[PDB]
Design a protein around this ligand. Structure first.
Ligand SMILES: COC1=C(OC)C(=O)C(C/C=C(\C)CCC=C(C)C)=C(C)C1=O
Lengths: 54, 49, 423, 446, 54, 57, 54, 105, 146
């Protein structure tokens, strides 16, 4: 069977980014959810290379 | 035949105030809970500190 | 002294409705509405409609919602129940006297103003499956169901419990049509126990003038006979064997009811050998240990079934049945005492009297009489009627059983249970 | 029409007299053509030893199989031929033998009861037959999960004490008990200060006393003497018994605190609070809309197949709580909800539900007391436990007195922060740990 | 939508929880006084007293 | 004499708001708890017996 | 959109000295923010329901 | 009766058109927020209306996706807007409120 | 069973046999519901030992050789002794069974005792059948000789 579904970690990723039923329908105003996440890590990753030196 | 079941004797374990089949237990309850609860109170008091 | 009693008061209304009350001066009250509406008035197309109906007794009415019927009745510690037999349905209602009027309103609501809402009825269908599952965990329930199926073509053959194929299939139109066609004035009686006759007569004239479905107790059951057989292993063969007797309230009916007590109904003595029981004694001579027998006596409007009901071990089934059968044959051939009959008479007389000792029992019986018979018949004259059964009437009843086209139901490991053919 | 209060005053005085002897002899008289008589005995099981447990059970089995004056099935043949029913029970505390008869038959009825209760042909042949019957009855009983869990619940709650014992006794005693053993117990217990002859129905009380002196004169004889004891108190423990068996499809649970017993005023308030919680069963119409929150949630969330509240009631002690039957997956939720009812009621009982409460009781009491048999039993039991018949108008007054404060006080006294006796049987993996049961007997919020 | 909650039983429910919800404030306040050593209230207190003022 | 059931024999079912579902009549069991190994259920997929509204002070 | 353009005012004004014009519009925009969210947007939604016979 | 209630009717009809759910084939009751009472009323709907309800919402979510509108003929007319839910909604609420009164006593 | 019984004919012919015979032919092709989960490895063991024996058996082969079969048989199929006789003997009895439904349509079968296989009387019945009418011959036909 398909291990994406069953494996305890990947399960979480599958439920959240893969197989998750989302609406047919949601507009560009929906995209800011991901983009906050991107901003969050990009902050972290440029923040850290700052802290090496700060 | 499910009537051959008696509960094992716990006398070794029973606190003293609860040793008599002949007398109520409703009585020692207060002191008994009192006692065990005091312990936990005292403990939090210390912990708090 | 407790007092002067009262007498029952009894009124045929000109639309055919019956009203009876006692003021026995009781702390609580019982109102039943008895309706010629039992399973017999179902047909091929709507079987089980009256079962679903029996269950449906607290779905929403025109001002009273389900929630209210439940909450209102529980608020007073009341009770609302329905009892089908194959002939009638009986909505009875029980509370303290200070609370009649609220319970009356709910009663009339349930019986004259059900809405049978689509969604409420859909929700209720699973309950037939549970309800049947509980009932049928008596082996006797299956047997008496198949007994009737086998005995009649017709109407009495219908079961008390909805056929499995029908569960989920009985519609709000079917219930609507059931109540409109069967819950009508001439099919009805309103019995009251510590209410007053004025109050009942008022309720009835105000709220229970409903004309016109139907008439007649009247398909007419056609007796037919034959046999049904359910392979099992359950532990034990239950078998019933029966022939056409006599309609309720005929004289011939009472002869059968005596013959039953000659032969043997239930026990009298906790863990007793049942020494005056003809059938039991007869089987026991043959048969070592575990069995039961009783004489079986069903009387309807129209018809009735008599004979006996055996429980045995699977191998002992033929022996138990064949013994029991011969014992009847022995009465038919003329072997009855006087005192043999007299003790049956006492067993029956005392029995009837005892069945009406209590509110639940009296009320059911008064209701049952109203519909059966259009009368109240007091116990002294019941005892009068019992007493009028001659010995020869009892013989002749046995003679009727023995010569009659037979009807049989059996369940179990049936490989030693006989076949009619073989009896 | 008469009012309900009016109707409570209407029921005749239960009428008590004594023999010069100590047989109390008592009647409620009525218009019925039909009656119930017989003998309620202060004998028990709470009375038997360990050795000689099962004895009263064994007597009940023998009591009807013959007398010296009525040998073999002579007695049977007599009862049957007048269309009477003859019956008996034994509880942990109480034995009864009773006849339902025609009222014209009250002479022979009392006469036969006399003969049974005094002249019991304990014939050696028969005691050998009945030992096999009873061992069969024991095998029968093991299949009744309900019958079992309550025996367990007695076994664990009153571990140590006579009250821990079954009525039937254990297999080994049935197998072993002698003719001697039985007449020993019979001599000990069936003596006349510890019997009431109750009747109810179409009788005069004069008429009954005549029949008492006719047929019961000389038991205490002269007699009792020497070796009357009373009962000791029984210790309530609480404590858990868990009989794991994943082959039976549904779990039974019985969970109880100690009650106060027969005499205590505050049974009325306990029964009120109990009635608020009430009982469910899957064949109850109306689900969803039931008053009792336990019953409501049970039905909506299918939690359950039945439950029932109880207030079992002994000399100076008691079991107070609840029994239920459910899926293996439900035992937890069902535990939660039952406990939560108790605690809501200990802390925050409200006025309306308490009235419902009171009404369910008035309805129960009056409905129960209907028929010569129920009423005769009530004469019966009540005289042994209370010393009077407590008349209906009294119970009303005692019911009327309960408000919300009474409930949440009286619930608190018995239930709040108390160790229960727990008993499980069936697929009971998911039955809460005792600690966690114990921890549901109080609120951190309260 | 406020409105629901007003009636004899709710009046009853209020009253039955009054000893508790004020015993909780008593917990709350003594708690808050102790944990900060408050000064204003704690100067009043007939042992506790002799930790500052002397 | 007329109570089509407790002429004592044919079936009568009974439902309720409050108390528990009943069935009827007569039929034996009855002299057959009494000789023995007649179990049965008491309590699987099911319901309670004599039952309730049945009581005390 | 009035909220958004009110927010755009409020962003401009804080970017901007505390001094004649400036103050009182800033004051008014402040009121308006709280007025739209607390009072005006709720009332619109009620009005809209009344117009739909709802 | 009169000439003024058909201005209120005219204003209503305007707002309706401004609301613009009809532009996506929707009836007014298609657009109701699904709270608890509303959820029950959808549940109580018979098979025909539920089936038409879902197709309507499927239509409009489809349009809504490709950011389109229906042809002007096929918009739903104000007159003709069928409030199929309301009788069921009213009744669900009627019951919730009976429950709520019982809870007070 | 669930698959098989989704023909109405399967139920009918099952009840037909049940009704016709006391005995042995009355037994069904399909296990009674009460028995599902109840039939033991001892019962199967006893079934094969008592019925799968030499005198109850035949070994038919199609494009094998007779030597090879005779060999297989003499080597591998000498098993004596359960039982004999075709021999309970079925007792014809008769009577009727009736299953209320709505299915769309009444299926009914009506039948009497005829003749054992391979008697002459059997062939007469097999002719009478073809007089009266077995299945179709002609796709979507009026069945004119029936
Ligand atoms: C279509 O709309 C969206 C969702 O709903 C239907 C989501 O569920 C997610 C999931 C969120 C992710 C991958 C980034 C969040 C990162 C952190 C660290 C919290 C995204 C991206 C999205 O666009």
């Amino acid at each position: 069977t398909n291990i994406r579904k069953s494996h305890p970690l990947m399960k979480i990723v599958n439920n959240a980014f893969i197989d998750l039923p989302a609406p047919s329908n949601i507009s560009s105003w929906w995209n800011f959810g991901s983009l906050l996440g991107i901003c969050l890590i990009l902050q972290i990753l440029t923040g850290l290379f700052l802290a090496m030196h700060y | 035949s499910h009537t051959d079941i008696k509960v094992p004797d716990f006398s070794d374990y029973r606190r003293p105030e609860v040793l008599d089949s002949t007398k109520s237990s409703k009585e020692s309850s207060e002191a008994r809970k009192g006692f065990s609860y005091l312990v936990t109170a005292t403990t939090t008091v210390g912990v708090a500190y | 002294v407790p007092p002067h009693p009262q007498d029952l008061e009894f009124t045929r209304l000109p639309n055919g409705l019956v009203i009876a009350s006692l003021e026995n001066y009781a702390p609580a009250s019982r109102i039943g509405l008895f309706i010629k509406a039992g399973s017999r008035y179902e047909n091929s197309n709507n079987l089980g409609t009256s079962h679903l109906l029996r269950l449906a007794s607290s779905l929403t009415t025109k001002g009273a919602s389900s929630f209210k019927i439940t909450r209102g009745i529980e608020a007073v510690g009341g009770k609302l129940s329905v009892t089908s037999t194959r002939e009638n349905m009986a909505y009875t209602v029980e509370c303290l006297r200070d609370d009649v009027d609220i319970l009356m309103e709910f009663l009339l609501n349930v019986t004259t103003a059900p809405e049978f809402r689509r969604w409420e009825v859909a929700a209720l269908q699973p309950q037939l499956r549970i309800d049947k599952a509980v009932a049928l965990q008596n082996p006797q329930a299956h047997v008496i169901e198949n007994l009737h199926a086998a005995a009649y073509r017709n109407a009495l053959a219908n079961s008390l419990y909805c056929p499995d194929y029908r569960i989920g299939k009985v519609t709000p139109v079917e219930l609507h049509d059931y109540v409109q066609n069967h819950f009508t004035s001439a099919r009805m009686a309103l019995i009251g126990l510590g209410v007053s006759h004025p109050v009942l007569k008022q309720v009835a004239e105000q709220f229970l003038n409903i004309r016109g479905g139907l008439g007649l107790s009247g398909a007419k059951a056609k007796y037919h006979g034959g046999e049904i057989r359910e392979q099992n292993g359950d532990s034990l063969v239950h078998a019933a064997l029966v022939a056409e007797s006599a309609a309720i309230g005929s004289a011939e009916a009472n002869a059968f009811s005596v013959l039953q007590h000659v032969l043997g109904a239930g026990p009298h003595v906790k863990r007793g050998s049942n020494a005056t029981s003809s059938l039991y004694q007869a089987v026991a001579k043959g048969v070592h240990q575990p069995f039961d027998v009783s004489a079986f006596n069903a009387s309807y409007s129209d018809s009735g079934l008599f004979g006996f009901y055996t429980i045995s071990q699977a191998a002992s089934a033929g022996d138990v049945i064949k013994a029991a059968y011969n014992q009847v044959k022995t009465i038919a051939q003329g072997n009855l005492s006087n005192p043999d009959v007299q003790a049956a008479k006492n067993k029956l007389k005392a029995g009837y009297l005892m069945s009406v000792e209590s509110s639940e029992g009296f009320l059911d019986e008064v209701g049952s009489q109203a519909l059966a018979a259009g009368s109240y018949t007091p116990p002294s004259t019941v005892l009068q009627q019992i007493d009028a059964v001659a010995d020869a009437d009892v013989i002749n009843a046995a003679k009727k059983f023995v010569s009659g086209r037979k009807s049989m139901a059996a369940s179990g490991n049936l490989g030693h249970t006989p076949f009619i053919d073989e009896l | 029409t008469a009012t309900y209060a009016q109707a409570l005053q209407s029921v005749p005085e239960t009428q008590v007299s004594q023999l010069d002897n100590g047989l109390r002899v008592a009647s409620e008289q009525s218009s019925q053509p039909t009656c119930t008589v017989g003998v309620w005995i202060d004998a028990g099981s709470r009375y038997e030893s360990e050795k000689n447990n099962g004895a009263g059970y064994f007597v009940e089995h023998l009591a009807f199989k013959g007398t010296k004056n009525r040998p073999g099935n002579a007695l049977e043949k007599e009862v049957e031929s007048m269309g009477a029913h003859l019956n008996a029970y034994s509880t942990r505390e109480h034995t009864a033998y009773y006849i339902k008869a025609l009222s014209k038959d009250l002479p022979k009825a009392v006469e036969l009861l006399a003969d049974i209760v005094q002249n019991c042909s304990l014939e050696d042949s028969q005691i050998e037959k009945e030992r096999d019957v009873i061992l069969q009855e024991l095998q029968e009983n093991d299949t009744s999960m309900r019958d079992v869990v309550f025996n367990y619940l007695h076994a664990t709650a009153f571990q140590g004490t006579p009250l821990a014992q079954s009525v039937e006794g254990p297999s080994e005693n049935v197998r072993k008990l002698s003719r001697a053993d039985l007449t020993e117990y019979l001599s000990r217990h069936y003596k006349a200060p510890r019997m009431v002859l109750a009747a109810a129905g179409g009788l005069e009380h004069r008429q009954l006393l005549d029949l008492a002196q006719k047929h019961f004169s000389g038991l205490s004889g002269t007699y009792d003497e020497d070796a009357v004891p009373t009962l000791s108190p029984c210790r309530f423990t609480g404590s858990q018994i868990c009989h794991r068996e994943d082959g039976l499809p549904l779990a039974h649970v019985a969970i109880a605190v100690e009650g106060p017993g027969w005499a205590h005023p505050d049974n009325v308030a306990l029964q009120v609070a109990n009635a608020i919680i009430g009982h469910y069963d899957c064949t109850y119409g109306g689900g969803a809309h039931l008053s009792s929150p336990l019953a409501s949630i049970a039905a909506t969330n299918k939690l359950c197949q039945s439950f029932q509240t109880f207030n079992i009631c002994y000399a100076d002690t008691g079991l107070l709580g609840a029994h239920f039957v459910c899926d293996h997956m439900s035992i937890d939720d069902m535990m939660f909800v039952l406990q939560g009812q108790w605690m809501r009621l200990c802390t925050s009982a409200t006025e309306s539900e308490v009235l419902r409460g009171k009404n369910l009781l008035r309805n129960a009491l009056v409905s129960h007391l209907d028929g010569t048999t129920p009423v005769c039993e009530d004469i019966g039991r009540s005289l042994l436990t209370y010393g009077r018949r407590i008349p209906l108008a009294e119970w009303e007054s005692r019911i009327a007195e309960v408000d919300a404060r009474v409930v949440r006080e009286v619930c608190s006294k018995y239930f709040y922060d108390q160790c229960p006796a727990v008993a499980g049987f069936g697929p009971i993996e998911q039955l809460p740990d005792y600690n966690r049961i114990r921890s549901g007997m109080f609120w951190l919020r309260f | 939508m406020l409105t629901r909650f007003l009636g004899p039983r709710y009046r009853q429910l209020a009253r039955n929880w009054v000893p508790t919800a004020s015993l909780w404030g008593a917990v709350g306040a003594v708690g808050l006084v102790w944990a900060t050593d408050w000064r204003l209230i704690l100067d009043w207190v007939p042992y506790i007293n002799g930790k500052f003022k002397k | 004499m007329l109570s089509v059931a407790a002429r004592s024999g044919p079936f009568a079912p009974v439902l309720s708001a409050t108390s528990r579902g009943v069935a009827g009549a007569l039929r034996p069991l009855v002299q057959a708890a009494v000789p023995a190994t007649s179990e049965s259920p008491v309590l699987d997929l099911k319901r309670s017996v004599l039952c309730r509204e049945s009581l005390r002070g | 959109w009035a909220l958004v353009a009110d927010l755009l005012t409020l962003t401009w004004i804080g970017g901007q000295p505390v001094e004649h014009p400036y103050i009182t519009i800033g004051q008014l925009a402040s009121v308006l923010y709280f007025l739209l969210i607390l009072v005006l947007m709720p009332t619109a939604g009620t009005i809209e329901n009344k117009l739909l016979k709802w | 009766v009169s000439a003024s209630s058909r201005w209120l009717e005219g204003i209503r009809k305007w707002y309706y058109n401004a609301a613009g759910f009809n532009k996506l084939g929707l009836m007014r009751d298609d657009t109701i927020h699904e709270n608890d009472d509303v959820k029950e009323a959808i549940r109580r709907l018979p098979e025909n209306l539920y089936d038409d309800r879902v197709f309507r919402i499927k239509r409009a979510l489809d349009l809504s996706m490709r950011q389109q509108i229906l042809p002007k003929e096929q918009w739903t007319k104000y007159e003709e807007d069928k409030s199929y839910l309301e009788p069921y909604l009213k009744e669900v609420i009627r019951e919730r409120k009976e429950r709520e009164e019982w809870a007070k006593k």
